[PDB]
Amino acid sequence: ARVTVQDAVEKIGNRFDLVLVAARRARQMQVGGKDPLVPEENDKTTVIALREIEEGLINNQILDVRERQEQQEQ
Amino acid sequence: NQALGKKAISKMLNTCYRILGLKPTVIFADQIMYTGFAYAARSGASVGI
């Protein structure tokens, strides 16, 4: 669980774009067709996406290139 | 090392935010409120005639 999101704020700094990025990642991990890249601690997908952002393996650029890679695969 | 009269404690919270960050000052505020309640109960302050 993440009490504060300051690390996510400082990973990519807007306090506004991180909401969009985390919402997109949570949609990916919630509607299906995606698995968390960070160990799952029985918590909800929102904080899982936030922790992925904080640990630096989820951002806008790599999400876009992942979209491109799965688009080219099919 | 003062009396902490509602102005030094707010100043210390402001300095903790400005120097350390957000999580440390949140934990510090929670601990301050815990210890303030506990020691106010211990002191047994009361108002009489």
Swiss-Prot record, chain A:
GO biological process annotation, one example: nitrate assimilation
Listed GO MF terms: bacterial-type RNA polymerase core enzyme binding; DNA binding; DNA-directed RNA polymerase activity
Lineage: superkingdom: Bacteria
EC number(s) recorded for this UniProt protein: 2.7.7.6
Record key words, sorted: DNA-directed RNA polymerase, Nucleotidyltransferase, Transcription, Transferase
GO CC, one annotated term: transcription elongation factor complex
UniProt catalytic activity: RNA(n) + a ribonucleoside 5'-triphosphate = RNA(n+1) + diphosphate
Self-association and partners: The RNAP catalytic core consists of 2 alpha, 1 beta, 1 beta' and 1 omega subunit. When a sigma factor is associated with the core the holoenzyme is formed, which can initiate transcription. The rRNA transcription and antitermination complex (rrnTAC) consists of RNAP, NusA, NusB, NusE (rpsJ), NusG, SubB, ribosomal protein S4, DNA and precursor rRNA; S4 is more flexible than other subunits.
UniProt family annotation: Belongs to the RNA polymerase subunit omega family.
Function (record text): Promotes RNA polymerase (RNAP) assembly. Latches the N- and C-terminal regions of the beta' subunit thereby facilitating its interaction with the beta and alpha subunits.
Protein name: DNA-directed RNA polymerase subunit omega
Location of this fragment in the whole protein: 2 to 75 of 91
Curated annotation (Swiss-Prot), chain B:
Record note on biotechnological use: Co-administration of salinamide and rifampicin or salinamide and myxopyronin suppresses the emergence of resistance to both antibiotics.
Residue runs in coiled coils: none
Processing after translation: Acetylated on several lysine residues in the presence of glucose.
Family: Belongs to the RNA polymerase beta' chain family.
Function summary: DNA-dependent RNA polymerase (RNAP) catalyzes the transcription of DNA into RNA using the four ribonucleoside triphosphates as substrates.
Quaternary structure note: The RNAP catalytic core consists of 2 alpha, 1 beta, 1 beta' and 1 omega subunit. When a sigma factor is associated with the core the holoenzyme is formed, which can initiate transcription. The rRNA transcription and antitermination complex (rrnTAC) consists of RNAP, NusA, NusB, NusE (rpsJ), NusG, SubB, ribosomal protein S4, DNA and precursor rRNA; S4 is more flexible than other subunits.
Full protein name: DNA-directed RNA polymerase subunit beta'
Organism the protein comes from: Escherichia coli (strain K12)
Lineage, uppermost ranks: Bacteria, Pseudomonadati, Pseudomonadota, Gammaproteobacteria, Enterobacterales
